[PDB]
PDB file of C-alpha atoms (C1' of nucleotides) in Angstrom:
ATOM      1  CA  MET A   1     -36.659  84.850 148.528  1.00 45.16           C
ATOM      2  CA  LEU A   2     -39.630  83.042 150.174  1.00 48.77           C
ATOM      3  CA  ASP A   3     -40.244  81.074 146.951  1.00 49.91           C
ATOM      4  CA  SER A   4     -36.734  79.488 147.306  1.00 52.86           C
ATOM      5  CA  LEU A   5     -36.977  78.852 151.108  1.00 50.99           C
ATOM      6  CA  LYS A   6     -40.245  76.838 150.802  1.00 50.59           C
ATOM      7  CA  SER A   7     -38.039  73.775 150.147  1.00 51.69           C
ATOM      8  CA  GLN A   8     -36.392  73.826 153.637  1.00 50.19           C
ATOM      9  CA  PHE A   9     -39.502  73.518 155.835  1.00 49.10           C
ATOM     10  CA  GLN A  10     -41.518  70.405 156.706  1.00 49.97           C
ATOM     11  CA  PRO A  11     -44.626  69.927 154.476  1.00 49.60           C
ATOM     12  CA  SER A  12     -46.773  69.189 157.578  1.00 52.74           C
ATOM     13  CA  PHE A  13     -46.157  69.172 161.363  1.00 50.79           C
ATOM     14  CA  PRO A  14     -44.385  65.939 162.446  1.00 51.92           C
ATOM     15  CA  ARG A  15     -45.129  63.787 165.558  1.00 51.75           C
ATOM     16  CA  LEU A  16     -41.465  63.384 166.607  1.00 49.17           C
ATOM     17  CA  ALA A  17     -38.910  66.274 166.542  1.00 50.37           C
ATOM     18  CA  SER A  18     -36.715  65.749 163.538  1.00 49.19           C
ATOM     19  CA  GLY A  19     -33.917  68.261 164.109  1.00 47.15           C
ATOM     20  CA  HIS A  20     -34.637  70.984 161.575  1.00 46.42           C
ATOM     21  CA  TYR A  21     -34.034  74.328 163.327  1.00 43.46           C
ATOM     22  CA  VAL A  22     -34.611  77.791 161.766  1.00 40.38           C
ATOM     23  CA  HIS A  23     -32.825  80.360 163.936  1.00 39.54           C
ATOM     24  CA  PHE A  24     -33.632  84.071 164.030  1.00 40.35           C
ATOM     25  CA  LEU A  25     -30.656  86.180 165.111  1.00 39.94           C
ATOM     26  CA  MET A  26     -31.763  89.579 166.407  1.00 38.49           C
ATOM     27  CA  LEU A  27     -30.734  92.639 168.267  1.00 38.34           C
ATOM     28  CA  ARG A  28     -33.660  93.898 170.415  1.00 38.23           C
ATOM     29  CA  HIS A  29     -33.005  97.613 170.813  1.00 39.91           C
ATOM     30  CA  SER A  30     -34.652  99.551 173.635  1.00 40.62           C
ATOM     31  CA  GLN A  31     -36.570 102.610 172.255  1.00 43.92           C
ATOM     32  CA  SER A  32     -38.336 103.881 175.368  1.00 44.72           C
ATOM     33  CA  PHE A  33     -37.585 102.899 178.961  1.00 41.71           C
ATOM     34  CA  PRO A  34     -38.480  99.199 179.389  1.00 40.62           C
ATOM     35  CA  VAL A  35     -38.717  97.701 182.920  1.00 41.21           C
ATOM     36  CA  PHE A  36     -37.602  94.053 182.967  1.00 40.02           C
ATOM     37  CA  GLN A  37     -38.243  93.575 186.715  1.00 39.35           C
ATOM     38  CA  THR A  38     -39.150  90.788 189.140  1.00 37.24           C
ATOM     39  CA  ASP A  39     -38.788  91.200 192.995  1.00 36.02           C
ATOM     40  CA  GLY A  40     -38.960  95.034 192.703  1.00 34.25           C
ATOM     41  CA  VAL A  41     -35.523  95.593 190.924  1.00 33.95           C
ATOM     42  CA  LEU A  42     -34.326  95.386 187.319  1.00 33.40           C
ATOM     43  CA  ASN A  43     -33.114  91.804 186.822  1.00 32.42           C
ATOM     44  CA  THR A  44     -29.292  91.648 186.639  1.00 33.17           C
ATOM     45  CA  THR A  45     -26.548  89.010 186.759  1.00 30.44           C
ATOM     46  CA  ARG A  46     -22.735  89.035 186.981  1.00 28.50           C
ATOM     47  CA  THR A  47     -21.088  87.808 183.780  1.00 29.98           C
ATOM     48  CA  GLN A  48     -17.634  87.884 182.228  1.00 25.91           C
ATOM     49  CA  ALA A  49     -17.302  91.000 180.009  1.00 24.11           C
ATOM     50  CA  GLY A  50     -16.224  89.030 176.849  1.00 22.91           C
ATOM     51  CA  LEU A  51     -14.925  85.719 175.440  1.00 23.79           C
ATOM     52  CA  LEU A  52     -11.218  86.845 175.139  1.00 24.18           C
ATOM     53  CA  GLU A  53     -10.030  85.369 178.495  1.00 28.34           C
ATOM     54  CA  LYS A  54     -10.981  88.368 180.804  1.00 29.65           C
ATOM     55  CA  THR A  55     -10.427  88.557 184.564  1.00 28.22           C
ATOM     56  CA  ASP A  56     -13.084  91.297 184.291  1.00 28.79           C
ATOM     57  CA  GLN A  57     -16.676  90.696 185.578  1.00 30.87           C
ATOM     58  CA  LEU A  58     -19.638  92.816 184.469  1.00 30.24           C
ATOM     59  CA  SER A  59     -23.219  93.190 185.893  1.00 30.95           C
ATOM     60  CA  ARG A  60     -25.630  92.976 182.885  1.00 30.64           C
ATOM     61  CA  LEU A  61     -29.408  93.334 182.638  1.00 30.13           C
ATOM     62  CA  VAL A  62     -31.272  90.030 181.953  1.00 28.14           C
ATOM     63  CA  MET A  63     -34.517  89.787 180.041  1.00 25.74           C
ATOM     64  CA  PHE A  64     -35.849  86.378 181.010  1.00 24.01           C
ATOM     65  CA  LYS A  65     -37.396  83.998 178.436  1.00 22.80           C
ATOM     66  CA  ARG A  66     -40.948  84.652 179.875  1.00 24.18           C
ATOM     67  CA  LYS A  67     -40.498  88.449 179.491  1.00 22.53           C
ATOM     68  CA  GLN A  68     -39.860  88.159 175.664  1.00 24.30           C
ATOM     69  CA  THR A  69     -41.795  84.954 174.649  1.00 23.19           C
ATOM     70  CA  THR A  70     -45.164  85.969 176.197  1.00 21.92           C
ATOM     71  CA  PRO A  71     -45.335  89.417 174.445  1.00 23.83           C
ATOM     72  CA  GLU A  72     -44.596  87.598 171.166  1.00 23.46           C
ATOM     73  CA  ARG A  73     -47.110  84.797 171.924  1.00 24.60           C
ATOM     74  CA  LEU A  74     -50.017  87.045 172.925  1.00 23.52           C
ATOM     75  CA  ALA A  75     -49.431  89.314 169.846  1.00 22.20           C
ATOM     76  CA  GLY A  76     -50.074  86.166 167.735  1.00 22.48           C
ATOM     77  CA  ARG A  77     -53.380  85.297 169.537  1.00 21.25           C
ATOM     78  CA  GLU A  78     -54.818  88.795 168.945  1.00 19.38           C
ATOM     79  CA  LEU A  79     -53.952  88.455 165.273  1.00 16.95           C
ATOM     80  CA  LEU A  80     -55.730  85.099 164.982  1.00 17.78           C
ATOM     81  CA  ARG A  81     -58.805  86.566 166.766  1.00 19.06           C
ATOM     82  CA  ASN A  82     -58.716  89.533 164.322  1.00 17.13           C
ATOM     83  CA  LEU A  83     -58.520  87.113 161.313  1.00 17.86           C
ATOM     84  CA  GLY A  84     -61.439  85.230 163.046  1.00 16.60           C
ATOM     85  CA  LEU A  85     -59.585  81.875 163.295  1.00 14.81           C
ATOM     86  CA  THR A  86     -60.111  81.821 167.109  1.00 14.48           C
ATOM     87  CA  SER A  87     -62.608  83.578 169.424  1.00 16.68           C
ATOM     88  CA  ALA A  88     -62.853  85.253 172.892  1.00 22.00           C
ATOM     89  CA  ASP A  89     -66.559  84.280 173.349  1.00 21.61           C
ATOM     90  CA  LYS A  90     -67.250  81.316 175.731  1.00 22.49           C
ATOM     91  CA  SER A  91     -70.156  80.172 173.461  1.00 23.30           C
ATOM     92  CA  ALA A  92     -68.029  79.851 170.282  1.00 19.60           C
ATOM     93  CA  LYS A  93     -66.799  76.450 168.922  1.00 17.20           C
ATOM     94  CA  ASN A  94     -63.219  77.851 168.304  1.00 17.72           C
ATOM     95  CA  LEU A  95     -62.691  79.380 171.789  1.00 18.75           C
ATOM     96  CA  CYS A  96     -59.116  79.587 172.987  1.00 18.51           C
ATOM     97  CA  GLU A  97     -58.072  80.852 176.508  1.00 16.77           C
ATOM     98  CA  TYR A  98     -54.372  81.392 177.330  1.00 16.64           C
ATOM     99  CA  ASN A  99     -53.702  79.285 180.495  1.00 19.34           C
ATOM    100  CA  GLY A 100     -56.696  77.332 181.971  1.00 18.45           C
ATOM    101  CA  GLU A 101     -58.782  74.280 180.854  1.00 18.18           C
ATOM    102  CA  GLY A 102     -60.202  76.464 177.994  1.00 22.56           C
ATOM    103  CA  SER A 103     -56.977  76.440 176.043  1.00 21.97           C
ATOM    104  CA  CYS A 104     -57.566  75.149 172.504  1.00 23.92           C
ATOM    105  CA  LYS A 105     -55.755  72.010 171.196  1.00 21.46           C
ATOM    106  CA  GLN A 106     -55.831  73.117 167.470  1.00 23.85           C
ATOM    107  CA  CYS A 107     -54.881  76.754 166.975  1.00 25.78           C
ATOM    108  CA  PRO A 108     -51.410  77.928 165.714  1.00 29.89           C
ATOM    109  CA  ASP A 109     -50.478  79.366 169.126  1.00 28.32           C
ATOM    110  CA  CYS A 110     -51.206  76.085 170.904  1.00 28.84           C
TER     111      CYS A 110
ATOM    112  C1'   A B   1     -43.195  62.285 179.979  1.00 29.03           C
ATOM    113  C1'   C B   2     -35.549  66.352 181.201  1.00 32.01           C
ATOM    114  C1'   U B   3     -37.071  66.854 189.521  1.00 30.48           C
ATOM    115  C1'   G B   4     -41.042  66.924 182.668  1.00 27.99           C
ATOM    116  C1'   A B   5     -45.324  69.281 179.092  1.00 28.30           C
ATOM    117  C1'   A B   6     -47.843  75.582 179.021  1.00 25.80           C
ATOM    118  C1'   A B   7     -45.958  79.842 182.498  1.00 24.92           C
ATOM    119  C1'   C B   8     -45.833  88.829 182.127  1.00 25.19           C
ATOM    120  C1'   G B   9     -44.596  90.516 189.854  1.00 29.74           C
ATOM    121  C1'   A B  10     -48.901  92.445 186.953  1.00 28.28           C
ATOM    122  C1'   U B  11     -52.483  96.470 186.956  1.00 26.60           C
ATOM    123  C1'   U B  12     -52.870 102.303 188.111  1.00 28.31           C
ATOM    124  C1'   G B  13     -50.270 106.634 189.381  1.00 27.55           C
ATOM    125  C1'   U B  14     -47.717 114.416 187.164  1.00 29.00           C
ATOM    126  C1'   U B  15     -41.599 115.166 191.893  1.00 34.48           C
ATOM    127  C1'   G B  16     -46.013 117.686 193.174  1.00 35.26           C
ATOM    128  C1'   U B  17     -47.870 122.353 195.484  1.00 33.91           C
ATOM    129  C1'   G B  18     -46.240 128.470 196.315  1.00 33.56           C
ATOM    130  C1'   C B  19     -42.423 131.798 195.140  1.00 31.42           C
ATOM    131  C1'   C B  20     -40.979 139.312 191.822  1.00 29.13           C
ATOM    132  C1'   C B  21     -33.150 138.381 190.694  1.00 27.31           C
ATOM    133  C1'   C B  22     -35.355 141.489 194.504  1.00 25.53           C
ATOM    134  C1'   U B  23     -33.847 146.336 197.147  1.00 24.42           C
ATOM    135  C1'   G B  24     -30.785 151.547 196.164  1.00 24.73           C
ATOM    136  C1'   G B  25     -28.303 154.539 192.443  1.00 24.64           C
ATOM    137  C1'   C B  26     -28.231 162.047 188.796  1.00 21.35           C
ATOM    138  C1'   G B  27     -23.803 159.908 182.858  1.00 22.57           C
ATOM    139  C1'   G B  28     -21.946 163.094 186.708  1.00 23.18           C
ATOM    140  C1'   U B  29     -18.359 167.110 187.024  1.00 20.84           C
ATOM    141  C1'   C B  30     -15.705 171.877 184.475  1.00 22.61           C
ATOM    142  C1'   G B  31     -16.007 174.643 179.813  1.00 24.04           C
ATOM    143  C1'   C B  32     -17.276 182.553 176.636  1.00 24.20           C
ATOM    144  C1'   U B  33     -18.525 180.022 169.546  1.00 20.95           C
ATOM    145  C1'   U B  34     -13.878 182.549 170.984  1.00 19.61           C
ATOM    146  C1'   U B  35      -9.919 185.564 168.541  1.00 17.36           C
ATOM    147  C1'   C B  36      -9.392 190.344 164.186  1.00 16.15           C
ATOM    148  C1'   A B  37     -12.193 193.486 161.083  1.00 19.12           C
ATOM    149  C1'   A B  38     -13.662 201.440 159.114  1.00 20.91           C
ATOM    150  C1'   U B  39     -20.011 200.696 155.228  1.00 21.39           C
ATOM    151  C1'   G B  40     -15.396 201.884 152.835  1.00 22.34           C
ATOM    152  C1'   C B  41     -13.388 204.469 148.358  1.00 25.70           C
ATOM    153  C1'   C B  42     -15.008 209.972 144.883  1.00 25.40           C
ATOM    154  C1'   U B  43     -18.846 213.685 144.177  1.00 25.99           C
TER     155        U B  43
END
RNA sequence: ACUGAAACGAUUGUUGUGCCCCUGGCGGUCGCUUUCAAUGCCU
C-alpha cells in the first residue's frame, strides 16, 4: 500500500498551499468515561437529528477542535523527544517549547 | 496577514464513616406387634 501512495504526496513542503488534501475519516469511540468540559458542564449543542428533513432537534455532546487536536499534537512532540530530534533542556540547540517564545521554527510539530 | 497566524478550564481528590434480618417458637398430638396355635403322635 504505502509504496503505491508515495506518488500522491508533495516531494517537499511548498511555500503556498496547493490544494492537495488527504482526509482521515474516523469514528472516535469512547472507552472509559471522557469529560469534554468547559465552564463546569459537558459541552453540548442543539442540532437537527439527521439530514432527512426532520422537525426533530437533538442535544448532542461537542468535542471542540482544541480538545482533540492538542492531545494528538502533544503525543507527537513526546515521540520526537524520545527519538532525540527535539529536546526539553533549555541549554540544547534543538529546544522546542509548546506555546512561548521558545517554540522551535524547524521541528515537525511546528 | 480571514476582526488573521499557534491556542487542554487544567491539576488533585474513595459517596465516605458505623450497623447482627434481628427477637420468640416442642414436628406436635393419639396408637397393645396384635389376632390363633396341645411338645404332639406310640412304647
